[PDB]
Design an enzyme around this catalytic site. Structure first.
Site, PDB file in Angstrom:
ATOM      1  N   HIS A  92       5.215  -7.410   2.088  1.00  0.00           N
ATOM      2  CA  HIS A  92       5.375  -7.430   3.566  1.00  0.00           C
ATOM      3  C   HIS A  92       6.858  -7.584   4.026  1.00  0.00           C
ATOM      4  O   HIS A  92       7.289  -7.007   5.024  1.00  0.00           O
ATOM      5  CB  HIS A  92       4.552  -8.543   4.212  1.00  0.00           C
ATOM      6  CG  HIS A  92       3.084  -8.474   3.923  1.00  0.00           C
ATOM      7  ND1 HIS A  92       2.447  -9.330   3.048  1.00  0.00           N
ATOM      8  CD2 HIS A  92       2.113  -7.692   4.432  1.00  0.00           C
ATOM      9  CE1 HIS A  92       1.154  -9.054   2.988  1.00  0.00           C
ATOM     10  NE2 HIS A  92       0.929  -8.046   3.844  1.00  0.00           N
ATOM     11  N   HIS A 118       3.603 -11.792   1.735  1.00  0.00           N
ATOM     12  CA  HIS A 118       4.306 -11.802   0.485  1.00  0.00           C
ATOM     13  C   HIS A 118       5.565 -10.890   0.556  1.00  0.00           C
ATOM     14  O   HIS A 118       5.904 -10.314   1.605  1.00  0.00           O
ATOM     15  CB  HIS A 118       3.353 -11.395  -0.679  1.00  0.00           C
ATOM     16  CG  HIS A 118       2.752 -10.033  -0.515  1.00  0.00           C
ATOM     17  ND1 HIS A 118       1.403  -9.790  -0.354  1.00  0.00           N
ATOM     18  CD2 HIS A 118       3.382  -8.850  -0.429  1.00  0.00           C
ATOM     19  CE1 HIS A 118       1.233  -8.472  -0.171  1.00  0.00           C
ATOM     20  NE2 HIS A 118       2.424  -7.906  -0.139  1.00  0.00           N
ATOM     21  N   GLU A 168       2.779   1.407   0.245  1.00  0.00           N
ATOM     22  CA  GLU A 168       2.057   2.471  -0.466  1.00  0.00           C
ATOM     23  C   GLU A 168       0.984   1.948  -1.381  1.00  0.00           C
ATOM     24  O   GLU A 168       0.255   2.785  -2.015  1.00  0.00           O
ATOM     25  CB  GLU A 168       3.011   3.292  -1.318  1.00  0.00           C
ATOM     26  CG  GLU A 168       3.970   4.193  -0.519  1.00  0.00           C
ATOM     27  CD  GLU A 168       4.849   5.024  -1.452  1.00  0.00           C
ATOM     28  OE1 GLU A 168       4.819   4.898  -2.661  1.00  0.00           O
ATOM     29  OE2 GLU A 168       5.612   5.841  -0.917  1.00  0.00           O
ATOM     30  N   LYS A 169       0.889   0.623  -1.623  1.00  0.00           N
ATOM     31  CA  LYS A 169      -0.116   0.142  -2.574  1.00  0.00           C
ATOM     32  C   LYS A 169      -1.565   0.567  -2.180  1.00  0.00           C
ATOM     33  O   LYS A 169      -2.366   1.000  -3.058  1.00  0.00           O
ATOM     34  CB  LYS A 169      -0.080  -1.431  -2.801  1.00  0.00           C
ATOM     35  CG  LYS A 169      -0.855  -1.846  -4.107  1.00  0.00           C
ATOM     36  CD  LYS A 169      -1.544  -3.262  -4.080  1.00  0.00           C
ATOM     37  CE  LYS A 169      -2.862  -3.059  -3.359  1.00  0.00           C
ATOM     38  NZ  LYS A 169      -3.582  -4.275  -2.866  1.00  0.00           N
ATOM     39  N   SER A 229       0.208  -8.479  -3.928  1.00  0.00           N
ATOM     40  CA  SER A 229      -1.032  -8.419  -3.166  1.00  0.00           C
ATOM     41  C   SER A 229      -1.365  -9.826  -2.713  1.00  0.00           C
ATOM     42  O   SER A 229      -1.138 -10.800  -3.520  1.00  0.00           O
ATOM     43  CB  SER A 229      -2.209  -7.986  -4.047  1.00  0.00           C
ATOM     44  OG  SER A 229      -3.437  -8.038  -3.303  1.00  0.00           O
ATOM     45  N   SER A 230      -1.789 -10.064  -1.493  1.00  0.00           N
ATOM     46  CA  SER A 230      -2.189 -11.510  -1.376  1.00  0.00           C
ATOM     47  C   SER A 230      -3.696 -11.750  -1.854  1.00  0.00           C
ATOM     48  O   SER A 230      -4.390 -12.777  -1.520  1.00  0.00           O
ATOM     49  CB  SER A 230      -1.591 -12.338  -0.161  1.00  0.00           C
ATOM     50  OG  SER A 230      -0.271 -13.013  -0.426  1.00  0.00           O
ATOM     51  N   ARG A 231      -4.201 -10.832  -2.690  1.00  0.00           N
ATOM     52  CA  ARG A 231      -5.286 -11.176  -3.601  1.00  0.00           C
ATOM     53  C   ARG A 231      -4.860 -11.665  -5.020  1.00  0.00           C
ATOM     54  O   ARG A 231      -5.687 -12.172  -5.790  1.00  0.00           O
ATOM     55  CB  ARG A 231      -6.378 -10.103  -3.671  1.00  0.00           C
ATOM     56  CG  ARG A 231      -7.190 -10.070  -2.399  1.00  0.00           C
ATOM     57  CD  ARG A 231      -8.317  -9.022  -2.457  1.00  0.00           C
ATOM     58  NE  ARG A 231      -9.281  -9.221  -1.365  1.00  0.00           N
ATOM     59  CZ  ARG A 231      -9.493  -8.379  -0.346  1.00  0.00           C
ATOM     60  NH1 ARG A 231      -8.778  -7.263  -0.220  1.00  0.00           N
ATOM     61  NH2 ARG A 231     -10.436  -8.664   0.562  1.00  0.00           N
ATOM     62  N   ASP A 276       3.120 -20.586   6.649  1.00  0.00           N
ATOM     63  CA  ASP A 276       4.044 -19.956   5.751  1.00  0.00           C
ATOM     64  C   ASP A 276       4.372 -18.586   6.349  1.00  0.00           C
ATOM     65  O   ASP A 276       5.502 -18.148   6.238  1.00  0.00           O
ATOM     66  CB  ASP A 276       3.444 -19.756   4.392  1.00  0.00           C
ATOM     67  CG  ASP A 276       3.248 -21.072   3.619  1.00  0.00           C
ATOM     68  OD1 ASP A 276       3.971 -22.052   3.916  1.00  0.00           O
ATOM     69  OD2 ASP A 276       2.388 -21.099   2.703  1.00  0.00           O
ATOM     70  N   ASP A 277       3.360 -17.906   6.907  1.00  0.00           N
ATOM     71  CA  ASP A 277       3.682 -16.545   7.460  1.00  0.00           C
ATOM     72  C   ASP A 277       4.788 -16.575   8.525  1.00  0.00           C
ATOM     73  O   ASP A 277       5.780 -15.795   8.485  1.00  0.00           O
ATOM     74  CB  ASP A 277       2.448 -15.893   8.123  1.00  0.00           C
ATOM     75  CG  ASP A 277       1.294 -15.538   7.098  1.00  0.00           C
ATOM     76  OD1 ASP A 277       1.492 -15.620   5.834  1.00  0.00           O
ATOM     77  OD2 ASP A 277       0.205 -15.221   7.642  1.00  0.00           O
ATOM     78  N   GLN A 332       8.211 -17.396   7.090  1.00  0.00           N
ATOM     79  CA  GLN A 332       8.835 -16.241   6.540  1.00  0.00           C
ATOM     80  C   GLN A 332       9.413 -15.312   7.582  1.00  0.00           C
ATOM     81  O   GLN A 332      10.511 -14.769   7.367  1.00  0.00           O
ATOM     82  CB  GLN A 332       7.855 -15.464   5.658  1.00  0.00           C
ATOM     83  CG  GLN A 332       7.308 -16.360   4.558  1.00  0.00           C
ATOM     84  CD  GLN A 332       6.987 -15.637   3.270  1.00  0.00           C
ATOM     85  OE1 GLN A 332       7.900 -15.253   2.519  1.00  0.00           O
ATOM     86  NE2 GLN A 332       5.692 -15.505   2.970  1.00  0.00           N
ATOM     87  N   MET A 383      -2.337  -8.389   7.801  1.00  0.00           N
ATOM     88  CA  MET A 383      -3.465  -9.356   7.970  1.00  0.00           C
ATOM     89  C   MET A 383      -3.003 -10.738   7.523  1.00  0.00           C
ATOM     90  O   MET A 383      -3.833 -11.560   7.081  1.00  0.00           O
ATOM     91  CB  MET A 383      -4.605  -8.813   7.093  1.00  0.00           C
ATOM     92  CG  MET A 383      -5.151  -7.569   7.745  1.00  0.00           C
ATOM     93  SD  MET A 383      -6.928  -7.212   7.614  1.00  0.00           S
ATOM     94  CE  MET A 383      -6.918  -7.110   5.822  1.00  0.00           C
TER      95      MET A 383
HETATM   96  C1  LIG Z   1       5.781  -2.817   0.048  1.00  0.00           C
HETATM   97  O1  LIG Z   1       5.037  -3.665  -0.875  1.00  0.00           O
HETATM   98  C2  LIG Z   1       3.770  -4.019  -0.479  1.00  0.00           C
HETATM   99  C3  LIG Z   1       2.794  -4.340  -1.491  1.00  0.00           C
HETATM  100  C4  LIG Z   1       1.516  -4.604  -1.152  1.00  0.00           C
HETATM  101  C5  LIG Z   1       1.105  -4.625   0.166  1.00  0.00           C
HETATM  102  C6  LIG Z   1       2.027  -4.428   1.169  1.00  0.00           C
HETATM  103  C7  LIG Z   1       3.350  -4.169   0.909  1.00  0.00           C
HETATM  104  C8  LIG Z   1       1.293  -4.518   2.342  1.00  0.00           C
HETATM  105  C9  LIG Z   1      -0.005  -4.879   2.093  1.00  0.00           C
HETATM  106  C10 LIG Z   1      -1.000  -4.931   3.096  1.00  0.00           C
HETATM  107  O2  LIG Z   1      -0.742  -4.585   4.266  1.00  0.00           O
HETATM  108  N1  LIG Z   1      -2.333  -4.845   2.721  1.00  0.00           N
HETATM  109  S1  LIG Z   1      -3.537  -4.631   3.888  1.00  0.00           S
HETATM  110  O3  LIG Z   1      -3.471  -5.679   5.008  1.00  0.00           O
HETATM  111  O4  LIG Z   1      -3.387  -3.297   4.615  1.00  0.00           O
HETATM  112  N2  LIG Z   1      -5.000  -4.748   3.185  1.00  0.00           N
HETATM  113  C11 LIG Z   1      -5.196  -5.996   2.444  1.00  0.00           C
HETATM  114  C12 LIG Z   1      -6.687  -6.133   2.265  1.00  0.00           C
HETATM  115  O5  LIG Z   1      -6.986  -5.088   1.280  1.00  0.00           O
HETATM  116  C13 LIG Z   1      -6.873  -3.758   1.974  1.00  0.00           C
HETATM  117  C14 LIG Z   1      -5.420  -3.540   2.402  1.00  0.00           C
HETATM  118  N3  LIG Z   1      -0.123  -4.945   0.725  1.00  0.00           N
HETATM  119  C15 LIG Z   1      -1.375  -5.078  -0.048  1.00  0.00           C
HETATM  120  C16 LIG Z   1      -1.940  -6.430  -0.381  1.00  0.00           C
HETATM  121  O6  LIG Z   1      -1.320  -7.437   0.048  1.00  0.00           O
HETATM  122  O7  LIG Z   1      -2.922  -6.336  -1.117  1.00  0.00           O
END
Ligand SMILES: COc1ccc2c(c1)cc(C(=O)NS(=O)(=O)N1CCOCC1)n2CC(=O)O
Ligand SMILES: COc1ccc2c(c1)cc(C(=O)NS(=O)(=O)N1CCOCC1)n2CC(=O)O
EC number: 6.3.2.1
Lengths: 274, 287
Positions: B45, B42, B157-158, B194-196, B86-87, B90, B38
């Protein structure tokens, strides 16, 4: 791993989803166009007409699925007789190895019409059609136009989930007096079977009355059903071809459903207004 | 087929452009790898991307699409971080060849109509208070799988419950894709990417290490059993300023209707101010 055996020009029967999935993938890589005809067995001339439509595509290999979504020998012989090369006959457990879990939720059309006495029927249909299309990955999938709401729901599934299959509707095969072919027709007794023709006769009278506008077409079909005894009409509805509301002028579809004793019959026809 | 320039970043908005380029690449032998995101990219991703790039002969498609159907309403959709420039910078730096950036109208031209209804797992944990959330996720991920038709699709896996539900989707609808889970990338103190994370102020960011420290204490505590594992995690979360725990749950790895045996996953969700953070870890009980 090794592709399952496939013998061109005979009826190859697979029960394992993974087997048909591998063979379909191998065939498609060889220059065949995979055609899927989904059925629930008990094959009749309407299914034969789906098969013949599929066989007409140059380069076709026809896959007929037989699955009852919760006779073998005769169905397969008919398929052999039609030159069908693939029959997919999975068990319920092979289709649902994890039980009922992720399913397809249809749009609101599935609540209308047939969706009245059978609220979850089309979620079931759409779920197994989805799975069939993912197992077999056909270029085209063929359905009869008799279950017209089902067909529309399928075309919504294909659009909505961006599936890469062509949906082909085949005109309903009919008995000589016009009664749409159906597994259920054999349950009618002679009075009920005679009365049943009123469904096809109402819709064809409506299609011709329609030069006089939508109200004339609806009233003609109602008068034909009113001339029949023991035909309890559930609905008689004019809609546009996607089953939205009928445009004031244009193409549409007239659908009827009725109960004759314990047997529910359905029919529908193309209508061109004015 | 629109243009495809290899070894450059090619950006496609139209679902039919990426579908045609993918199918064309697949027919010339390239294996197509999808990383659905989305945006707001970071390092986590980029680990997904690097995992995809390591598949021999791969072409990597990264989708960016803030999916409206998985947001409740209550401002959440509008507030999601959007960092388009930025996306794409990257992705160019990582050598990604295809970005797929669909409009909301291209993805939902008829609004919400046919949708995926997940199994009962969608009503547990993150989905208890958000009953339609995972339907939105699995609907979009299905469409993306159909449009791109990847050989393998990569997720972190987060958001482990999301991952388990995506494996469910794949198995239950017989999709011909391999789902690859990649271990969570973490800041140096252990905080999950997390991008939160951008919404933690400095005090919250200090305090947020407690999620990872709680999980990794629990994983080591687990030699002593499930209760010791959970009570070690609880102790660390309780010592942390301003962390409000939503849930702390130890379940079997599939999160399904089966009791914990030897292999478990410990899941935490906690609010720091208005920011809700997730984390999880593998747990081996005893042994
Ligand atoms: C391999 O290391 C990582 C660590 C965290 C990751 C990712 C990769 C990929 C994501 C991400 O895809 N999160 S999301 O788009 O599926 N989504 C964010 C909105 O909250 C529900 C999950 N996120 C979660 C995030 O950005 O919160
Ligand atoms: C091209 O012309 C037609 C005409 C009628 C058709 C068909 C095609 C296909 C069906 C049909 O219902 N097929 S089925 O496989 O879903 N199933 C057959 C066994 O009884 C339940 C319906 N039917 C209706 C039926 O068999 O009940």
């Amino acid at each position: 791993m090794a592709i399952p055996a496939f013998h061109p020009g005979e009826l190859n029967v697979y029960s394992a989803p993974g087997d048909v999935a591998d063979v379909s993938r191998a065939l498609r890589l060889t220059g065949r166009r995979v055609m899927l005809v989904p059925t629930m067995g008990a094959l009749h001339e309407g299914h034969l007409a789906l098969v013949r439509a599929a066989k007409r595509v140059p380069g076709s290999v026809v896959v007929v699925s037989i699955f009852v979504n919760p006779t073998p020998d005769d169905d397969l012989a008919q398929l052999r007789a039609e030159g069908v090369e693939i029959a997919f006959t999975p068990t319920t457990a092979a289709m649902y190895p994890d039980g009922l879990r992720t399913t397809v939720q249809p749009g609101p059309l599935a609540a209308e019409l047939e969706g009245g006495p059978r609220p979850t029927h089309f979620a079931g249909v759409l779920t197994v059609v989805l799975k069939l299309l993912q197992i077999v990955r056909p270029d085209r999938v063929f359905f009869g136009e008799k279950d017209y709401q089902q067909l529309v729901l399928i075309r919504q599934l294909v659009a909505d989930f961006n599936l890469d299959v062509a949906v082909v509707g085949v005109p309903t095969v009919r008995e000589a007096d016009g009664l749409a072919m159906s597994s259920r027709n054999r349950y009618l007794d002679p009075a009920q079977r005679a009365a049943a023709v009123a469904l096809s006769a109402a819709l064809t009278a409506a299609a011709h009355a329609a030069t006089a506008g939508a109200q004339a077409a609806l009233d003609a079909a109602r008068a034909v059903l009113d001339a029949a005894p023991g035909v309890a009409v559930d609905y008689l509805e004019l809609r546009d071809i996607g089953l939205g509301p009928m445009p004031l002028n244009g193409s549409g579809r007239l659908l009827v459903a009725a109960r004759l004793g314990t047997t529910r019959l359905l029919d529908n026809i193309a209508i061109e207004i004015g």
